[PDB]
Amino acid sequence: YVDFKPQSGGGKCFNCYPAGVNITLANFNPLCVAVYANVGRWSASINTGNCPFSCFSLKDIPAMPIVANWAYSKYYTI
Amino acid sequence: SKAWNRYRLPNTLKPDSYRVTLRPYLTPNDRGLYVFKGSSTVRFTCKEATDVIIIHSKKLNYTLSQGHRVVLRGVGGSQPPDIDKTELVEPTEYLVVHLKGSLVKDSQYEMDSEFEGELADDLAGFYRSEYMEGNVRKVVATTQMQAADARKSFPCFDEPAMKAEFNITLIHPKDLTALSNMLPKGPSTPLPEDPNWNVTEFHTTPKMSTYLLAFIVSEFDYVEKQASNGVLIRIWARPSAIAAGHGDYALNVTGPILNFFAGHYDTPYPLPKSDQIGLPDFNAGAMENWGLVTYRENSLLFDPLSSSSSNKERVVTVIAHELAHQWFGNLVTIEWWNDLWLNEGFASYVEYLGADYAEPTWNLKDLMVLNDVYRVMAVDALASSHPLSTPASEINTPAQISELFDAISYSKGASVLRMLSSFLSEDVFKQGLASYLHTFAYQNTIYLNLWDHLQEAVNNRSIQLPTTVRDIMNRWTLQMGFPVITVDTSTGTLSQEHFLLDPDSNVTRPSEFNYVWIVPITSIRDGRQQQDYWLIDVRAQNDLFSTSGNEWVLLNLNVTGYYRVNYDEENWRKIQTQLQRDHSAIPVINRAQIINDAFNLASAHKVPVTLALNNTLFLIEERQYMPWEAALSSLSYFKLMFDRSEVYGPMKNYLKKQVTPLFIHFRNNTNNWREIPENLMDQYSEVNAISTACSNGVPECEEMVSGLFKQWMENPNNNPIHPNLRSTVYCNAIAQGGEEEWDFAWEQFRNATLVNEADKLRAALACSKELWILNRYLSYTLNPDLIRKQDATSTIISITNNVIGQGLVWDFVQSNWKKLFNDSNLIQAVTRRFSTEYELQQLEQFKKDNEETGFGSGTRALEQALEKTKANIKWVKENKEVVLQWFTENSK
Ligand SMILES: *[C@@H]1O[C@H](CO)[C@@H](O[C@@H]2O[C@H](CO)[C@@H](O)[C@H](O)[C@H]2NC(C)=O)[C@H](O)[C@H]1NC(C)=O
Ligand SMILES: *[C@@H]1O[C@H](CO)[C@@H](O[C@@H]2O[C@H](CO)[C@@H](O)[C@H](O)[C@H]2NC(C)=O)[C@H](O)[C@H]1NC(C)=O
Ligand SMILES: *[C@@H]1O[C@H](CO)[C@@H](O)[C@H](O)[C@H]1NC(C)=O
Ligand SMILES: *[C@@H]1O[C@H](CO)[C@@H](O)[C@H](O)[C@H]1NC(C)=O
Ligand SMILES: *[C@@H]1O[C@H](CO)[C@@H](O)[C@H](O)[C@H]1NC(C)=O
Ligand SMILES: *[C@@H]1O[C@H](CO)[C@@H](O)[C@H](O)[C@H]1NC(C)=O
Ligand SMILES: *[C@@H]1O[C@H](CO)[C@@H](O)[C@H](O)[C@H]1NC(C)=O
Ligand SMILES: *[C@@H]1O[C@H](CO)[C@@H](O)[C@H](O)[C@H]1NC(C)=O
Ligand SMILES: [Zn+2]
């Protein structure tokens, strides 16, 4: 589950790194075997990294980046 | 004869750098005034011993320090004299520090000041702009320094050749962002004396002119993107606008244009960022402040679902203009305002290179012919015009300076640069400009420096010309006006003369060149381009211009040259025959040329008016935008002269006949107005066809526009009118309707969210045919709670453009002149209908009654209006009957 809001409110940047971030993988403390609406041009997806497919964990393991783009032009990693 | 009573600064002192701290107060004081407080230190070098410090200061109150208005300190061991006294000299806008001794040659000194000024709503200096966010009043602190208002925010040597470095600090509410030319130096920090304020210091600026400084405090939001040349681009606007995406197009075009200009001119943009910011209140279109370019919202923001294609073209062209100034104006700066075209003409030309780059399918460079060449030839055919480069000794006061921000400096500058690029080729031109920019970066230039570097480029490329660049271009730069080239195709003879709309006008400005030009003449024969020619003399002969049999020739292919062309009557007839046979055989731009030239020659009594009118006959089957626009613009004079006379009926009947087939064509091609053409020029052609049909009484047009406006009234939140058509639909629906349509449009205006829509409604509201409604609207134009001050005069002009509003507005100006002045375009617009002895006498009596008050930056304009009025009186007398007969015989 992921949710985020675009920066705004005064002096902030609307097409930069999102203001609010919540990446909550349930059952985490390393666990082993979309809320954000279309707020303007902002969208997001999961992208591949070192693993070939598209034990999970948000902490470093001895990865797959979560990308969030604006108008398919400005991309931001979480 | 006292230095403090002369308008130009002495040459005795020259600044090196400044620090300035400014603190705006965005809430009123006990007196209801918005104020800012500041401090400054200027470091300067004494070039010649003097016992006085003369520095600009405007509407600033000084806080005493160590017993005087300023503190004077030594540098590097210097021991400055004690201060005797200071004075504020209001006419020359100076602070004058009288000293008990003389400064030492080649020594440095520092002067410290502490001051306060009004953050007025006057759009000049450091001022306030206001908008609403819901029910919350938002107040913004912003700047406009050009030409001579930097002195209104802090004391400075406020002349463009007094370049210096600037160290800016802004003290602002802790919740609000401070912006300046440079990026912030570190984080904003709370003010120690009061943590409700933050202190934001900015990095030192490059060496630069005072008129380019900017200080903005707001809670705007922005979007940003690093451009491919590494420059950070930010688009700043009211939070709602940024969130709505109205800055996205500017972000799309700004960086790419900047990189394009840097590459094209082989000259990097040297600053780390270029901010673009849109202000709710701004006098001009924009201002090229180095690092912090300001714009009207209507020149920067754009809404793809409600803004027109014309709005988009304005945005991209204004951005290109302001970015062009980063090279032509900021990096290299005029020595003095007399050479203003070196900034604005280049920017006026180079904008087309940038905009065409951003929108290569629009073919905007072509529009330079209508929007610049023919725009400026109107005023540059007057005896009261002025040279591209005015003598420096004539330009001294702020009024004389602001007078030069006119059609000559912008549009003639651009036209002459277009011509130079054409005969040199653009590649050679830009090589020479790159050399110019490299040599004079961070310095100041006059026109001769430009000629020298262009000559270096010509020599490097072995371009052969009839003489040096200097001798060719001085003819176009140091004397006013332009030639008409008259061709006798029987013999192939050419001659030139200074083109004057009134043969009787009294030319009083001498020219060392005798109003003779060196003219690059291009030409086509029966559609095939011929060899280029150089006209060096008052007259010449060449077989290029001789014809026999059926052949015709035309000069000035694509109107690259800044001159008008006349022909013998036989060649004119051949041209008209070609237009009837197959008008596509003549380049569209040369068709516009044929129309505009013929109409102007007719005004000057060089061709019969019937020849110019005959040149419009083919328009009944012309679908291209440009020739129609040239015709409509030329006929605008006929409308101004005749729309209160018996001629207007027949004139409208003629235009109705000529435009009806085009209107029906667009009705079919657009699927009954459901779509708009893909090509920009076709979109503009459609808009002109609708405007012409409705203005001249085509019943299908009146029905269409009233129906569309009623449908909007029935669904106010679902506007069914394509943005391109809104201006004309609104105007004609209001004209065709009554109080209910007017009140609807007014309420849409007051609640408007996009400035383009507001602009269209505000213009449309002046189209009411009811005098009482126009009077009420006039009363609204003066209330800043109803119409923003930045838009007051524009709206009055819209009213004066209405035939029913002419007398209303002229009487208003006569009745309210003192109040208006104490609290230029208006004179020009209000007087252009004048065609009677009575109106001339009214204008002269107005002049007499207000000579003491003066006319400021409208002085020249009044003289031009008088000249035009006298010409208009004579022209109507000579033509009113013949034109009536022509329209009568051709309207059937
Ligand atoms: C504006 O800021 C610059 C940068 O600090 C100042 O330039 C410095 O001046 C001192 C004093 O002469 C020198 O020791 C430094 O080497 C200079 N630094 C640079 C980078 O030039 C400049 O004096 C400031 N101007 C004012 C009016 O305060
Ligand atoms: C004069 O202007 C015309 C029209 O703007 C130019 O013709 C265009 O040339 C471009 C470049 O090849 C073509 O892509 C267009 O299709 C042409 N337009 C038309 C309507 O055919 C012409 O090249 C210009 N010539 C000069 C010397 O300036
Ligand atoms: C959102 O984030 C907060 C902490 O930032 C957390 O307490 C909450 O559980 C998160 N909600 C979801 C649905 O992930
Ligand atoms: C400056 O002084 C004048 C005259 O004393 C006064 O009217 C004006 O309000 C002052 N301005 C400010 C900003 O205090
Ligand atoms: C002002 O300074 C405070 C100090 O921490 C900071 O929290 C705040 O974000 C600053 N305001 C701006 C607009 O940067
Ligand atoms: C501008 O926006 C359009 C979307 O219509 C996009 O295709 C284009 O790539 C953008 N320009 C740049 C330089 O990214
Ligand atoms: C107008 O021309 C006359 C002579 O033709 C000349 O004396 C006069 O000075 C001119 N007008 C002006 C304003 O100089
Ligand atoms: C063109 O104007 C002439 C008079 O200058 C007139 O005799 C002629 O009829 C006009 N052309 C047409 C097609 O009527
Ligand atoms: Zn400009």
Residue numbers in the entry:
A (entry chain D): 305 to 333, 338 to 341, 352 to 372, 386 to 393, 397 to 412
B (entry chain A): 68 to 890, 899 to 967
Paper text:
The coronavirus spike protein (S-protein) is a trimeric single-pass membrane protein that mediates receptor binding and fusion of the viral and host cell membranes. It is a type-1 viral fusion protein possessing two regions, the S1 region that contains the receptor-binding domain (RBD) and the S2 region that contains the fusion peptide and heptad repeats involved in membrane fusion. HCoV-229E and HCoV-NL63 are both alphacoronaviruses and although closely related, they have evolved to use two different receptors, aminopeptidase N (APN) and angiotensin converting enzyme 2 (ACE2), respectively. Reported here is the X-ray structure of the HCoV-229E RBD in complex with human APN (hAPN).
Crystals of the HCoV-229E RBD–hAPN complex were obtained by co-crystallization of the complex after size exclusion chromatography. The asymmetric unit contains one hAPN dimer (and associated RBDs) and one hAPN monomer (and associated RBD) that is related to its dimeric mate by a crystallographic two-fold rotation axis. The structure shows that receptor binding is mediated solely by three extended loops, a feature shared by HCoV-NL63 and the closely related porcine respiratory coronavirus, PRCoV. As our complex shows, HCoV-229E binds at a site on hAPN (H-site) that differs from the site on pAPN (P-site) used by PRCoV. Glu291 in hAPN, a residue in the hAPN–RBD interface, is an N-glycosylated asparagine (Asn286) in pAPN and attempts to dock the HCoV-229E RBD at the H-site on pAPN leads to a steric clash with the N-glycan. The HCoV-229E RBD binds to hAPN in its closed conformation and structural comparison shows that the H-site does not differ between the open and closed conformations. With reference to the HCoV-229E RBD–hAPN complex reported here, we now show that 73% of the amino acids in the receptor-binding loops and supporting residues vary among the sequences analyzed (52 sequences in total), while only 11% of the RBD surface residues outside of the receptor-binding loops show variation. Finally, we show that the six invariant interface residues on the RBD (Gly313, Gly315, Cys317, Cys320, Asn319, and Arg359) constitute only 45% of the viral surface area buried, the very region expected to be the most highly conserved from a receptor-binding standpoint. Indeed, our analysis of the six RBD classes shows that the receptor-binding loops possess a remarkable ability to both accommodate and accumulate mutational change while maintaining receptor binding.
